[PDB]
């Protein structure tokens, strides 16, 4: 029972479920959540710290770069993987695990990658969200040793190599359903769904591809056989000359170009929380907007705001009196 940081973020109190609890210092000390550090001094102390061996982290990296997941992995992640590897090797016999895993099998469909399947509240033609089910919706929930990993990359490598891992649910998991980003220029796959530029060739070219991994160790990934996904419509447009200074915003063509620092003030990024015990004493129902600061005059916006505006093609026609920032 090797606990990853995902169980600690989700308040997964599975300490009574297992007995061989082993954790890393750098998977518990980096968490900036206050409630986790609060409950850490409250939770019963039967977890213990263990260090992996350099040979086993070397082997774990050796087949993890054959799985095609090594750029997506992190150092403490490899610590967790090789810790579980060492525990299952030292307790259980080593003949269960298999190395140099299976090949991929390609089977595409007509469905869009943005089809809203496997969302709990979404239902095509009954799927309801009940307070009996709010504790149930975590993931695709299906003996002695296991993992408490929430990342798909960890589940992927642990299941390709062959360990039975589990979730916040007490029962061991069977299938892994998720999405990955694949470059369609260099054909390199990254398990990090947040990024937009690929690590290999750096173009803004990652696209979603669905991946399902069975309990045997066989993986199959579905592409989308849809002409809308691979369409060069809104891609070539005339670019402005690069401007410098403290105020210039650039069209963001590379993943690591140096942008000028344009942050928001504290009052500008306060969101009203309504379930605070002292919210009712507020003279206004809402947090007051910020108009006085210099960031308000410069029309500085959050990264989240204006997402569908970027998805419009620049070679189009907007409204006559509107200006796009």
């Amino acid at each position: 029972v090797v606990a990853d940081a995902g169980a600690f973020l989700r308040h997964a109190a599975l300490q009574d479920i297992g007995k061989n609890i082993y954790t890393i210092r750098e998977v518990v000390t980096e968490i900036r959540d206050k409630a986790t550090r609060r409950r850490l001094a409250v939770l019963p102390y039967e977890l213990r710290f263990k260090e992996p061996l350099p040979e086993y982290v070397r082997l774990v990296t050796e087949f993890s770069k054959k799985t095609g997941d090594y750029p997506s992995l992190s150092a403490t992640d490899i610590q967790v993987l090789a810790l579980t590897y060492q525990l299952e090797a030292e307790f259980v016999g080593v003949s269960h695990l298999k190395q140099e895993p299976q090949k991929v099998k390609v089977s595409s469909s007509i469905q869009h990658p943005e089809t809203p399947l496997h969302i709990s509240g979404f239902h095509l033609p009954g799927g309801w969200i009940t307070p009996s089910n709010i504790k149930q919706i975590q993931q695709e929930l299906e003996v002695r040793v296991g993992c408490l990993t929430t990342d798909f990359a960890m589940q992927n490598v642990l299941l390709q190599m062959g360990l039975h891992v589990l979730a916040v649910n007490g029962m061991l998991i069977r299938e892994a359903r998720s999405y990955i980003l694949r470059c369609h220029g260099c054909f390199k796959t990254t398990s990090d769904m947040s990024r937009v530029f690929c690590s290999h060739c750096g173009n803004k070219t990652l696209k979603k591809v669905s991946v399902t991994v069975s309990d045997d160790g066989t993986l199959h990934m579905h592409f989308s056989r849809n002409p809308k996904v691979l369409n060069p419509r809104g891609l070539r447009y005339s670019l402005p000359t690069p401007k410098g200074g403290k105020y210039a915003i650039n069209p963001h063509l590379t993943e690591d170009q140096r942008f000028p620092q344009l942050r928001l003030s504290q009052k500008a990024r306060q969101k009203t929380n309504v379930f605070a015990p002292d919210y009712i004493a507020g003279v206004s129902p809402f947090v007051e907007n910020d108009i006085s600061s210099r960031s308000a005059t410069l029309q500085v916006r959050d990264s989240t705001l204006g997402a569908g505006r970027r998805r419009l093609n620049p070679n189009a026609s907007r409204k006559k009196f509107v200006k796009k920032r």
Binding site: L124, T272, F275, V283, F286, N289, A296, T297, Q299, F321
Partner: protein
């Protein structure tokens, strides 16, 4: 058990998809209601269950999700869940004044102002939230606050400059015993 269904437009599908968990978590935890999103009819459907705590919570949920769909932020309709006396007046810009074409667009501009600042200024004086659909204006707040915001907005789209609007709305807020 009874239910309410509310529709969603095409442009409001993605904000519903992104903020989905922040929508259905207070509906299912504090109110105790079943919720789903019918994709064929494109309707958010909320029904009462056996473990619903009290009546009129379904109407709170309907107001919450409808306010989110109209364009308000998820926190601003969580305010509708918690508070009692909050309402939604909405009206067309061409209602008070017959405007055609470009003039109408300029009216929209002076509801926003530069950078939206004028709009935010009203949100500081009337203590309300205001959402601009393409020809429509939605106000969320208390009744006298909604009326104050509506007078300010109608003063803006009859030609009055923002300075007179700020002065008048601050005077009215001063006499409002706030």
């Amino acid at each position: 058990e009874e239910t309410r269904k509310i529709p969603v437009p095409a442009n409001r599908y993605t904000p519903l998809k992104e903020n989905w968990m922040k929508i259905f978590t207070p509906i299912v935890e504090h109110l105790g209601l079943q919720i789903r999103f019918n994709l064929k009819s494109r309707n958010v459907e909320i029904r009462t269950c056996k473990e619903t705590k009290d009546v009129s919570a379904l109407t709170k949920a309907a107001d919450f999700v409808k306010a989110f769909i109209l364009g308000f932020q998820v926190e601003d309709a969580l305010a509708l869940i918690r508070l009692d006396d909050l309402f939604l007046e909405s009206f067309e810009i061409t209602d008070v004044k017959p405007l055609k074409g470009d003039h109408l667009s300029r009216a929209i501009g002076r509801i926003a102002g530069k950078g939206g600042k004028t709009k935010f200024t009203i949100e500081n004086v009337t203590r309300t939230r205001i959402v601009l659909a393409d020809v429509k204006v939605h106000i969320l707040g208390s009744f006298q606050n909604i009326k104050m915001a509506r007078t300010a907005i109608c003063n803006l789209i009859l030609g009055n400059p923002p300075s007179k609007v700020y002065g008048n709305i601050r005077a009215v807020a001063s006499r409002s015993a706030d």
